[PDB]
Paper text:
The [name]-[name]-2 spike (S) trimeric glycoprotein is a focus of vaccine development because it is the primary target of host immune defenses. Like other type 1 fusion proteins, the [name]-[name]-2 S prefusion trimer is metastable and undergoes structural rearrangement from a prefusion to a postfusion conformation upon S-protein receptor binding and cleavage. Here, we describe the structure of a leading [name]-[name]-2 S vaccine candidate (NVAX-CoV2373) based on a full-length (FL) S, residues 1 to 1273, which includes the transmembrane (TM) and the cytoplasmic tail (CT). The final construct, [name]-[name]-2-3Q-2P, was also modified at the S1/S2 polybasic cleavage site from RRAR to QQAQ to render it protease resistant, along with two proline substitutions at residues K986 and V987 in the S2 fusion machinery core for enhanced stability.
Residue numbers in the entry:
A (entry chain D): 295 to 676
B (entry chain C): 14 to 294
C (entry chain F): 736 to 1029
D (entry chain A): 540 to 588
E (entry chain F): 197 to 245
F (entry chain F): 99 to 147
G (entry chain E): 981 to 1029
H (entry chain E): 736 to 784
The structure:
């Protein structure tokens, strides 16, 4: 505490007085990792080794649940030229759980890959497939030029060229109502100013790169605000109560002291929030117990200092510690804890201002110097 | 096999105010929006309850006490307890609580509930207990020293497997377990209610009625009974089987039933919400 | 204020980034310290005016006058007068003369208890240097001083003066002849004794007069509660919670989000300190007048 | 006319809103006359008028 | 909204005769249906007796 | 149990896909199809005697 | 708002909101300082009255 | 000060973004109100003696 | 200053994994740049070498 005062004041010398210091803090000693009881691996094969992809015209949406998102399983044989995540840094994927997870699946032309991103325009972005402005997922794409290609052209892949308006995010429209143009009434018949709304792709194996077919997978998911049925490969540990710990609960990290709670979460609520929107309770993913999370740091400390040009001894006042040696129960497993002080010395004095450690106490009274508080002062004497 | 615990500090009994506790539903009848007059053996209102304060593990000059005395049954027993860690686990009901006659043993042990009526050779200082710690943090239960032997067993009942929470806790009491035990015309009738609490020192003031729970067809003479508590043992408290133990975080109360008449108040859903002890004043 | 805890409570990455806004965190602390020093000086200037602490005389024969509800009641554990107990009982403080222990917040209660919630966000309250008992001793001394010597208890050695004479001189001061006091001594004493009882009864009945004191207390409480509520603001960030930022983002992205929250939290603290300084100037002015009037 | 688990009588059976506890088969009115029953095959509560 | 048809709900006992009861409650999330369609109008389906 | 379902969509006709939600006897079915809807759709219960 | 899509516009809007709030905070602070001075003047004037 | 109008006068997108630091906008007005109240008291102390 | 050049051959789809902050078998197991990388990256298609 004296050095802390010296650092604060940018000085090697501290004048006699009272200085405030940082709150008393303790460090966490172990980490608790908890994930839901998921035993299965996610259907990476079905998603990336599919016999067929939908045309962009009428894209598919697969729901994903009760599995491990171990993305590394694709490292042995998949190769993706295109990759971009929007709602999360990709380096964090293995420490997170994912929820409300869906995989959109379709085929587009290579020059159209750039139109998938949110905020883009063009015939695909406007008429076939669109992501929202605030998309929170990640996009994967690759050059399937030996799967989706045919010598005479692959005409099983279709896209919409005409619509009277643009699509909203995640919409599909499979209507074949003939497109009318030029205020020229049309009774469903292709002709002047009347078009079938759909067109096919070529995708011959002999075309240049911009014309090769590409497979696009869009992973749409949410993080940290709901129970998850899909999670990364990180292994869990046992949970320790009434200790200062580090933790990871379904991707939500932090530190603090976990205590049992009496809060009653609804069946769909995984996490709670306090009055200033900070998580203060969680529902454990393996057993649905509710635990309150209390910060490790607390209280306050101040230091009673004689001039440092006289003595390097100081006395320390603890704002949240009584120091009265009240008899307590013996926990069977735990040993009775100590006072939240940096050190307990030879002189412990208890007052209304908090307990003071290191100053001798006398029953005398005098003129105030180096005021401590609540009727108490101190001085340096032989 | 059993052992006498020899480290207990000798402390006096405490007494408390029963207030309005010990009320139960008089029959299996749906009634509502009505006041009803009945007669039965009930804990009298504002009665003298013996307080078996039993958490004395604290202090340098330790007061460790594991209080499991034999108490009279009289006309029926009001029993209640407050606990935070599943310590109060059972009862022995009988004549002399000895091998000479049949008696009733009810124990909630880890993973099951067993009720037997046998000629048990009971321990003078019976107990249950949990010991394992250190290699892993799970607590594990292994001690059962209630009786050394038993024979001529009848009414053997075993419940279904379950898991039990053994870990000791700090903080307030969480579980109020209120019971009424009666022995009438061949049946041992037990009524009960489990209510959440957050108290620190004594039986909470308040009112509820207990539900019928069970009727056990056991034709025995119950004159006295004994409360069965579990011990906390660990690496932290060395000693042999008579000394290497601590008291856990639980305590209990005993009152007695007397014939009384009551006015019971049934609300619109048939819940008893209040009562008048007609002999109180 | 623990200016680190308010911003980066229990957060390593935030804590290191926050080191850059260094002398500023310290500057806020200096300003609050200066206020705290003045609050004790103000108390001392108003009450600790005379170092001679006089005991209430054993003689209560201050002419026909009573004064017992003004003077300290020796039968109480307190050193307060009857009127003072009413003043103290009517103003509501969140608490007084008590320290909350860390373990007291290890429960659900931490989220309901504003004192606990403020402490966990680095906001603390410092105890006064002078206690109620010491103040009671100062008012006791002043009362013993003025009941016996009156004007002369100050500006020199105290001189005892008969109470009737003290008032005769006070009347001469106003310009009322001394003859009135002696001729009407019983009337004056009866009017006074009645008036004091009326004040005491008025105080027992209506506490609204104390609203000024209640407001000082409420205003500081509100300012601290505001600092806690303001923690929820995003300030351009994705989320106001450091843990959400740290969980989803890598360092270089987390840093942007963290800087946005640090700036916002700093604005909240700077605003707080400024308001406390303005309020401090106003309380000093009141205290200076109070000291002057004493 | 009726017989509910041996309890006989006559009257008009209407659906009720009374909530019997799991162990209560029959109820009683203010003058101890059965005025509601729990049906033995489906646990519906019927008032008897 | 944005590809989802969100439905919230609550089931509450009533004993009213003529109109929507006055009172307050909040509905729970129930379900999120991932259906990418344009809903502009709707029709209520009733059964006949 | 009369109010059993809803139709949500564009024109509520066969030209485009729309959402049909129905609580029918014994089950709940949700489908999104190019339905050719009835102008006066209904469900119903008949058998008696 | 005209030239930018929402997520880009949000950056630009946040800069202006922060800016405007800082301007208002400055205003309020100055008014509070001036208010202290006017009170002092008023108190002196009241004393002289 | 209408602290919303000053920032997002007649602008919906801005207004919604402005709701996040909402307590602040309120506090600015509270401070101004305190000044405003004191101004009438100052007048009363000086003249209404 | 303190200038070094790292050099290697990878598959073309993996070029994108070189940038700091990326993941993938190269970014995770073969070669990685730091979060605060202060340098510059160059790459080309040596398809005839
Ligand atoms: C917060 O919740 C507690 C506990 O209630 C239980 O948990 C909730 C989350 C819900 O799921 C509840 O449906 C569930 O019961 C509430 O405490 C309880 O309140 C009820 C009254 O609503 C109390 O009932 C009384 O019981 C006495 C004795 O029988 C009667 O005389 C009274 O007339 C009345 O029926 C009940 O005892 C009480 N529980 C405990 C342990 O004290 C709490 O009120 C609720 N808070 C709020 C703001 O709603
Ligand atoms: C500091 O400790 C004293 C000592 O009392 C004991 O420890 C307290 C924390 C509390 O647990 C007491 O019950 C213990 O006896 C406290 O003084 C006590 O104050 C309480 C409340 O008024 C009173 O019930 C006790 O009898 C007092 N005990 C004695 C012997 O003085 C004091 O309040 C504590 N200060 C704090 C926590 O701020
Ligand atoms: C996707 O399909 C490829 C095959 O095209 C799978 O890769 C093969 O995996 C087996 C082991 O099961 C190896 O023996 C083969 O040598 C691999 N083939 C190639 C070309 O590398 C791949 O595992 C499948 N991916 C998923 C997620 O199911
Ligand atoms: C959702 O359906 C509505 C109603 O059909 C569409 O709005 C109409 O669009 C046609 C052109 O296709 C116009 O001629 C009408 O005047 C519009 N009506 C109204 C009330 O605006 C709307 O465009 C559809 N949305 C999407 C994304 O397709
Ligand atoms: C606890 O101590 C009591 C004595 O205070 C023991 O009681 C005696 O036990 C012996 C057998 O060892 C009998 O022969 C005596 O007749 C008993 N005396 C009485 C008065 O009962 C008791 O057995 C001890 N229990 C344990 C578990 O050690
Ligand atoms: C709790 O009591 C049960 C029931 O008495 C114990 O389980 C029995 O163990 C015996 C061993 O001889 C078996 O023959 C029974 O079939 C078991 N019963 C059941 C229902 O499984 C159980 O071991 C006791 N708990 C502890 C911790 O010892
Ligand atoms: C925790 O560790 C204890 C100690 O090794 C395990 O309990 C032992 O189990 C063996 C049988 O495998 C018994 O022979 C020992 O007597 C037991 N120990 C004690 C002190 O009684 C316990 O099973 C482990 N628990 C978990 C969850 O791993
Ligand atoms: C209760 O158990 C005892 C055993 O402790 C029974 O005693 C029997 O006594 C006869 C005497 O002729 C012996 O031949 C038997 O072998 C004994 N039985 C056993 C199991 O040892 C006694 O009969 C039993 N009483 C009842 C009612 O069951
Ligand atoms: C001052 O007035 C008080 C009353 O306000 C007088 O004391 C009371 O004396 C009666 C005697 O019957 C007691 O019942 C009251 O309890 C006393 N009250 C208090 C507050 O002490 C007191 O004697 C008067 N003193 C002088 C000097 O006139
Ligand atoms: C001045 O007025 C007071 C009343 O305000 C007079 O005192 C009261 O006289 C009545 C006469 O009936 C008594 O009952 C009251 O007890 C008296 N009050 C007090 C406090 O003594 C007083 O006499 C008048 N004085 C002069 C000079 O006219
Ligand atoms: C209520 O709807 C269900 C579901 O559509 C009907 O049951 C289905 O009947 C078809 C007949 O072709 C079967 O192929 C399906 O397998 C059945 N589904 C299920 C879940 O059983 C049911 O018949 C309808 N109710 C009525 C009264 O007609
Ligand atoms: C799921 O529970 C079983 C016990 O039934 C346990 O053995 C397994 O390790 C748990 N699961 C996971 C996915 O970690
Ligand atoms: C119960 O009776 C005993 C008799 O020794 C007495 O000391 C105690 O105070 C009584 N307690 C109550 C609560 O009435």
């Amino acid at each position: 505490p004296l050095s802390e005062t010296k650092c604060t004041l940018k000085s090697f010398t501290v004048e006699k007085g009272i200085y405030q210091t940082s709150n008393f803090r303790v460090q966490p000693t172990e980490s608790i990792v908890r994930f839901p009881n998921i035993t299965n691996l996610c259907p990476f094969g079905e998603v990336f080794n599919a016999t067929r992809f939908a045309s962009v015209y009428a894209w598919n949406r697969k729901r994903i649940s009760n599995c491990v998102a171990d993305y590394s399983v694709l490292y042995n044989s998949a190769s993706f030229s295109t990759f971009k995540c929007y709602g999360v840094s990709p380096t964090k994927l293995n420490d997170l759980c994912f929820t409300n997870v869906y995989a959109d699946s379709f085929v587009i032309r290579g020059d159209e890959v750039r139109q998938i991103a949110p905020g883009q325009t063009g015939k695909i972005a406007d008429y076939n497939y669109k992501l929202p402005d605030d998309f929170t997922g990640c996009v994967i794409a690759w050059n399937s030029n030996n799967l989706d290609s045919k010598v005479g052209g692959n005409y099983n892949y279709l896209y919409r060229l005409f619509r009277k308006s643009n699509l909203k995010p995640f919409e599909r429209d499979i209507s074949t109502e003939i497109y009318q143009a030029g205020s020229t009434p049309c009774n469903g018949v292709e002709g002047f100013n009347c078009y079938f709304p759909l067109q096919s792709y070529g995708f011959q194996p002999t075309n240049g790169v911009g014309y090769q077919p590409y497979r696009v997978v869009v992973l749409s998911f949410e993080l940290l605000h709901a129970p998850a049925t899909v999670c990364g490969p990180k292994k869990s540990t046992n949970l320790v109560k009434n200790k200062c710990v580090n933790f990871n609960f379904n991707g939500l990290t932090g530190t603090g002291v976990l205590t049992e709670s009496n809060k009653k979460f609804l069946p769909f609520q995984q996490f709670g929030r306090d009055i200033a929107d900070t998580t203060d309770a969680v529902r454990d993913p393996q057993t649905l117990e509710i635990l309150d999370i209390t910060p490790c740091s607390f209280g306050g400390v101040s230091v009673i200092t004689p001039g440092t040009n006289t003595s390097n001894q100081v006395a320390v006042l603890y704002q949240d510690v009584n120091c009265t040696e009240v008899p307590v129960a013996i926990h069977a497993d735990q040993l009775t804890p100590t006072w939240r002080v940096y050190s307990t010395g030879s002189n412990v004095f208890q007052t209304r201002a908090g307990c003071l450690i290191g100053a001798e106490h006398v029953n005398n009274s005098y003129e105030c110097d180096i005021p401590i508080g609540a009727g108490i002062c101190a001085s340096y004497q032989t | 096999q059993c052992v006498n615990l020899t480290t207990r500090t000798q402390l006096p009994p405490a007494y408390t105010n029963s207030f309005t506790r010990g009320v139960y539903y008089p029959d299996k009848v749906f009634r509502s929006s009505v006041l009803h007059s009945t007669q039965d053996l009930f804990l009298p209102f504002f009665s003298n309850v013996t307080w078996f304060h039993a958490i004395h593990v604290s202090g340098t000059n330790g007061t460790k006490r594991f209080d499991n005395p034999v108490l009279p049954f009289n006309d029926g027993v009001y029993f209640a307890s407050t606990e935070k860690s599943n310590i109060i686990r059972g009862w022995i009901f009988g004549t002399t609580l000895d091998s000479k006659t049949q008696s009733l043993l009810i124990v909630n042990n880890a993973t099951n509930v067993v009720i037997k009526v046998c000629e048990f050779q009971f321990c003078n200082d019976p107990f249950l207990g949990v010991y394992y710690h250190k290699n892993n943090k799970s607590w594990m239960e292994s001690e059962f020293r209630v009786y050394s032997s038993a024979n001529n067993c009848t009414f053997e009942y075993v419940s279904q497997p379950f898991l039990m929470d053994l870990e000791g806790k700090q903080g307030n009491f969480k579980n109020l377990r209120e019971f009424v035990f009666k022995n009438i015309d061949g049946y041992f009738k037990i009524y009960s209610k489990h209510t959440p609490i957050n108290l620190v020192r004594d039986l909470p003031q308040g009112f509820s009625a207990l539900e019928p729970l069970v009727d056990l067809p056991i034709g025995i003479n119950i004159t006295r009974f004994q409360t069965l508590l579990a011990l906390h043992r660990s690496y932290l408290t060395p000693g042999d089987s008579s000394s290497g133990w601590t008291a856990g975080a639980a305590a209990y109360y005993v009152g007695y039933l007397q014939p009384r008449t009551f006015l019971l108040k049934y609300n619109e859903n048939g819940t008893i919400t209040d009562a008048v002890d007609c002999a109180l004043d | 204020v623990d200016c680190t805890m308010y911003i980066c409570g229990d957060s390593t990455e935030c804590s290191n980034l926050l080191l850059q806004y260094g002398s500023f965190c310290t500057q806020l602390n200096r300003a609050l310290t200066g206020i705290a020093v003045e609050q004790d000086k103000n108390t001392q200037e108003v009450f600790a005016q005379v170092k001679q602490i006089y005991k209430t005389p054993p003689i209560k024969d201050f002419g026909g006058f009573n004064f017992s509800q003004i003077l300290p009641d020796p039968s109480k554990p307190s050193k307060r007068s009857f009127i003072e107990d009413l003043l103290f009982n009517k103003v509501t403080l969140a608490d007084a003369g008590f320290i909350k222990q860390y373990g007291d917040c290890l429960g659900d209660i931490a989220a309901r208890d504003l004192i606990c919630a403020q402490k966990f966000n680095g906001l603390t309250v410092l105890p006064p240097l002078l206690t109620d008992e010491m103040i009671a001793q100062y008012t006791s001394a002043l009362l013993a001083g003025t009941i016996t010597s009156g004007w002369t208890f100050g500006a020199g050695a105290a001189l005892q003066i008969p109470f009737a004479m003290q008032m005769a001189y006070r009347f001469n001061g106003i310009g009322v002849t001394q003859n009135v006091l002696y001729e009407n001594q019983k009337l004056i004493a009866n009017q006074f004794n009645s008036a004091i009882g009326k004040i005491q009864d008025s105080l027992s009945s209506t506490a609204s007069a104390l609203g000024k004191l209640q407001d000082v207390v409420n205003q500081n409480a509100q300012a601290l509660n505001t600092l806690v509520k303001q923690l929820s603001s995003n300030f351009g960030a994705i989320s106001s919670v450091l843990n959400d930022i740290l969980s989803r983002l890598d360092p270089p992205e987390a840093e942007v989000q963290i800087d946005r929250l640090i700036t916002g939290r700093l604005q909240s603290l700077q605003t707080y300190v400024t308001q406390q300084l303005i309020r401090a100037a106003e309380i000093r002015a009141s205290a200076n007048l109070a000291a002057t009037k004493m």
